[PDB]
Design brief:
Order of helices and strands of chain A: H
Helix content of chain A: 10-25%
Largest sheet of chain A: none
Strand content of chain A: under 5%
Oligomer: part of a larger assembly
Distance between the termini of chain A: 81 Å
Chain lengths: ~50, ~50
C-alpha cells in the first residue's frame, strides 16, 4: 500500500487471511495376473528344468 | 454303567509295484515332464534280406 494525501480514503487493513481448499483428483490403473502365472509362481515344482 | 474295552487298528497289506511279478513285464521309468507330453513315438526302419 501507498501513503496517501491529506484525507483521501485509503485502506486500514494488513494481512488478509484468505483460505484455499484442496481439490482432489485420484488416479487409477489395473494390472492383471492369470491362474497359470500364480500356479507356476508360488506352487513351485521340485521337478525338472 | 458303560465300559469301553479297547481300540484296535486294522493292519493293511501294503503292496508296491516293483515287488510284484507284473513289474517284470514293465520297464519302469520316472519322468516328471510327462504332463507336457502329448504323444511319444518310436519309428523303426528295416530292410528285408
Amino acid at each position: 500500500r501507498v501513503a496517501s494525501g491529506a484525507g483521501l480514503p485509503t485502506s486500514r487493513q494488513t494481512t488478509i487471511m484468505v483460505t484455499k481448499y484442496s481439490e482432489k483428483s485420484p488416479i487409477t490403473i489395473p494390472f492383471e495376473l492369470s491362474a497359470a502365472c500364480l500356479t507356476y509362481l508360488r506352487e513351485t515344482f521340485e521337478g525338472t528344468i | 454303567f458303560e465300559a469301553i474295552f479297547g481300540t484296535f487298528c486294522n493292519r493293511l497289506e501294503w503292496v508296491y509295484f516293483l515287488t510284484s511279478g507284473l513289474a517284470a513285464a514293465a520297464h519302469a521309468i520316472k519322468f516328471h515332464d510327462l504332463n507336457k507330453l502329448t504323444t511319444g513315438k518310436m519309428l523303426f526302419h528295416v530292410q528285408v534280406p
